[PDB]
Amino acid sequence: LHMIPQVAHAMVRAAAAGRLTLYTRTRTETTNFDHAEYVTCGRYTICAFCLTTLAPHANVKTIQDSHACSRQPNEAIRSLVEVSDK
């Protein structure tokens, strides 16, 4: 089973005080969501394409994954971070 809603409760609390760092496929952080795949807190890591938990810990430089797709609303948590980043 995908997510395990204790994970999603850590998504919103990291996005209601936006610490969420969106990482691309080349393991670099961006803030645009278009090139980004990995989503951190930094407790949990989720690739935005397949939308599954990947590592309990953060620092996505040490994660192995094989998925490939496109756009994935919810952008709403991504939108909630930049509002709460102020």
Binding site: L1, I4, P5, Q6, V7, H9, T53, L54, A55, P56, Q64, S66
Partner: protein, 604 residues
């Protein structure tokens, strides 16, 4: 044939009814099949050995021949007239009941006799390690003897009969080779009565030890079939019984366990305080549910156990808020109207029962340990029972404080004594618990990679998780033990997994440019650490987010591999690292030879 012997009571014609257990003045003759003579002979053989000590000490009564307890009757021998009819045995060897009694009490009486001497012979024999496991090593006999002439304490029996014990000994230790009378020299070969057995136990340098490697396998095979490691990740209802849960009482530390990390524990997350009251033993106390969320043991989803909340060594700040002192700490149930996590104020809490209070206020239970007064180790304790909470939708066990008079001082305290080490002990194995519900069967595969890091360590004593952990743990010791999942030998275990990764990564490559031909050197190595990470910490296979291990294939796969793997080990499985193992044994015999060299000088 087997069983008691029967004979045609109706004479001549022996049909399935004209038979009858041939009983009589001696009891009933039971047949002594070939193998059952091996035992009674092997038992008597081990007693006859002590012949030289029986005469010396005038006990015993001559050598015990098994042919003195049997007879040579003949008839049909089975378990029942019907089947005994198909075992016509002529002049078979049967032992009558009254005889099966002596061969018993004789082997028993003699067994005591020898068991004693045999103990003296030993404190003297092993008292100079007559057993090495690589190459040889002597120790000039004179010294050796003149040495034990010392050490051996004055109450042995190897000093009263030297060469009356020696003759018994020579047959048990192929180390002591007696000097032949007519050439007055040893023999090279040593001929101890256990000739074969002792030959097949020597640590043969080719492969560790047949007697070892053989058992370590049959041992693992036992478990594999026994507990039911097979079917370890079966996807379908299984009676808890199938998990033989025993001696299983796990302890925690609630008031810390997050509610979502373990269904059996909800919390009163409410704005202000919820001071309630209750007449307990006349005196009126106030349960607090203070400032913080106060996580309480939920009662539903709580397999009628024996909750025993220990409150000791934990802080007890009666020093600051004087409000805390005077209040007898006590485990109390709390039935709420509206579901907790929705229970705002006092009028919401139906009732509150003090299921177990602690006599004497919080100022006798204390004990100063450097300013911070602690709690004198004491155990409050209910005995929750499934049905005593029938109907009652909401009820929670809470090990709180019961303040005799709430004040401003205790306005930020929150008297939950749950920070203590609570120990629930399921008192009714048949019923398990999963995800908050009580059941009678688990679905193994469901509990794999379905718990979180701590949705495991926070499991409730005898709940699916704790059961699907006790199980993997057996299977984890069968591999850890028998299979070599701890060397670069790409064993049967890490091999079963590799085949899954391939078949898996291979179809995920099907459809689309297939630009990546499967690896294999990388797959073998990835599955090696997967099978290895399992043997290591069996638990992990329950946590969501563990590489390989948590895909549905593995485990179901692993076990069935490890399975057939044990059923073929051969005997010489010990050939693994039987090189350094050998070289280490020679290392010991070289050091032990060094010992004999001193025994040889000091006591010339």
């Amino acid at each position: 044939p087997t069983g008691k012997l029967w004979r045609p009571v109706g004479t001549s014609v022996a049909t399935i009814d004209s038979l009858a257990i041939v009983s009589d003045r001696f009891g009933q003759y039971s047949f002594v099949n070939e193998g059952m003579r091996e035992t009674f002979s092997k038992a008597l053989f081990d007693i006859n050995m002590w012949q030289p000590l029986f005469q010396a000490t005038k006990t015993g009564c001559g050598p015990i021949v098994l042919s003195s307890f049997t007879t040579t009757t003949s008839g049909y021998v089975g378990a029942t007239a019907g089947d005994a009819l198909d075992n016509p045995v002529t002049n078979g060897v049967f032992i009558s009941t009254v005889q099966i009694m002596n061969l018993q009490r004789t082997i028993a009486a003699r067994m005591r006799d020898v068991a004693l001497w045999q103990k003296h012979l030993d404190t003297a024999m092993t008292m100079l390690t007559p057993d090495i496991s690589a190459g040889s090593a002597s120790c000039n006999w004179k010294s050796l003897l003149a040495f034990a002439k010392d050490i051996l304490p004055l109450d042995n029996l190897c000093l009263t009969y030297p060469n009356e014990f020696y003759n018994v000994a020579i047959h048990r230790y192929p180390a002591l080779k007696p000097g032949n009378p007519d050439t007055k020299l040893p023999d090279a070969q040593a001929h101890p009565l256990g000739e074969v057995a002792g030959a097949f136990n020597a640590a043969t340098s080719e492969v560790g030890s047949l007697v070892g490697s053989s058992s370590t396998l049959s041992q693992a095979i036992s478990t594999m079939a026994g507990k039911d490691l097979d079917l370890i990740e079966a996807d379908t209802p299984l009676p808890v019984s199938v998990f033989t849960p025993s001696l299983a009482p796990r302890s925690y530390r609630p008031a810390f366990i997050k509610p979502e990390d373990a269904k059996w524990i909800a919390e009163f997350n409410n704005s202000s305080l919820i001071r309630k009251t209750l007449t307990y033993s006349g005196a009126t106390y106030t349960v607090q549910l203070g400032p913080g969320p106060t996580r309480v043991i939920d009662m539903n989803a709580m397999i009628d156990s024996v909750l025993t909340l220990d409150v000791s060594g934990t802080i007890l700040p009666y020093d600051t808020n004087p409000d805390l002192s005077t209040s007898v700490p006590a485990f109390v149930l709390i039935q709420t109207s509206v579901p907790i996590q929705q229970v705002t104020t006092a009028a919401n809490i139906t009732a509150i029962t003090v299921v177990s209070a602690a006599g004497a206020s919080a100022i006798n239970l204390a004990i100063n340990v450097r300013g911070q007064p602690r709690f004198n180790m004491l155990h409050l304790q209910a005995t929750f029972e499934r049905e005593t909470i029938t109907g009652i939708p909401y009820i929670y066990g809470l090990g709180t404080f019961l303040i005799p008079s709430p004040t401003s001082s205790s306005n930020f305290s929150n008297p939950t004594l749950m920070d203590g080490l609570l120990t629930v002990t399921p008192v009714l194995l048949r019923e398990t618990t999963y995800k908050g519900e009580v059941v009678d069967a688990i679905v193994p595969a469901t509990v794999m990679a379905n718990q979180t890091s701590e949705e495991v360590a926070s499991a409730l004593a005898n709940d699916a998780i704790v059961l699907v952990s006790n199980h993997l743990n057996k299977l984890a010791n069968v591999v850890g033990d028998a299979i070599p999942v701890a060397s670069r030998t790409d064993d049967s275990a890490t091999s079963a997994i590799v085949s899954r990764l391939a078949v898996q990564h291979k179809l995920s490559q099907v459809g689309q440019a297939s630009p990546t031909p499967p690896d294999y050197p990388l797959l073998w190595r990835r599955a090696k650490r997967a099978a290895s990470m399992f043997v290591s910490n069996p638990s992990l296979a329950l946590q969501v987010g563990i590489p390989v291990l948590t895909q549905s294939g593995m485990l179901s796969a692993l076990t069935s591999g490890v399975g057939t793997a044990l059923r073929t080990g051969s005997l010489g499985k010990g050939v693994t690292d039987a090189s350094e193992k050998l070289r280490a044994r020679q290392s010991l015999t070289v050091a032990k030879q060094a010992f004999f060299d001193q025994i040889g000088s000091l006591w010339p």
